Amino acid sequence: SSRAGLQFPVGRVHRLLRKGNYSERVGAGAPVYLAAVLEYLTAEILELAGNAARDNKKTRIIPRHLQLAIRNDEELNKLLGRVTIAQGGVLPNIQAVLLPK
DNA sequence: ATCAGAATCCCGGTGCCGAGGCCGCTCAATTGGTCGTAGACAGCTCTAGCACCGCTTAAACGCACGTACGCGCTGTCCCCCGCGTTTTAACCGCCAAGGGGATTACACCCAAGA
C-alpha cells in the first residue's frame, strides 16, 4: 500500500483474491489495481456524502446522506441500480399532476 | 384582493450514549532464497473477412378520400378526505387456594439409664 500510494490494503486484497477461488494464479498488479479502484470509488462516494451533509448542516455522514449522494449522481445510480440502502429513504420527488391546479 | 387560522422552521438548552483518541501484543505482512511452469515472442498458414459486379423484385414512398379512434366538455353521484369517540395491542395489585410454630393450668412424690 505504501509503494503504490494507496490507503486500501494490498496484501489483504491479494489474500482475499487468492482465497476466493477465482483463478489458479494471481499476479502482483491485479490486487493493486483492484485496491486503487475501490479507493477511488470510496473517495467519490464519501466526497458526495460529505457534500450532501454540508448541504444539510450535518457533520456526520448518515445513511440519508449516502442515499442522497448515490441517487443524485447519474453514474452512481446506474452502477447501484439494484442496490438498496438501509435507512436511506428516497428522493423528494413530487409529480406535477399531483400539485394543486 | 384581504384576513384568521392552525401547521412548520429555527433558536436558548442540555446532557448522554455514541463517536473519537490511546496501550499491549501477536498473527498477518515483509524480507531473503530456491524451483519452475505458464507467459511473452517468432514463425507458417489458409480460412475467413472484405470490396465489387450481373440480374432480379417485392418492399417503400407519394397520391385520394373519408372516418373512427382521439380528445375537449358535460350530468351524476360516489367513496374516499377529514374530524370525534374509545378500544384492542399489550402492560402492572389485592382475593382465599395451603406450608407451618403453638397445647393439653399450677406445686410436690415415687422408680430406672448414661
- CATH number of the domain encompassing residue A43: 1.10.20.10
First-residue to last-residue Cα distance in chain A: 60
Say how many domains are in chain A: 1
CA distances for A40 relative to A21, A33, A35, A51, A80, angstroms? 25, 11, 9, 16, 16
Containing structural domain, residue A79: 1-99
Give this entry's resolution in angstroms.
5.7
Distance B112 C1' – A16 CA (angstroms): 97
Q: Which one, of A17, A15, A7, lies nearest residue A39 by Cα? A: A7
Q: Which one, of A45, A54, A41, lies nearest residue A72 by Cα? A: A45
Experimental method, per PDB record:
cryo-EM
Show which residues sit with Cβ under 7 A of nucleic chain B. A 1, 9-12, 15, 24-25, 60
Tell me the three cell numbers of residue A74.
447519474
Distance B98 C1' – A23 CA (angstroms): 77
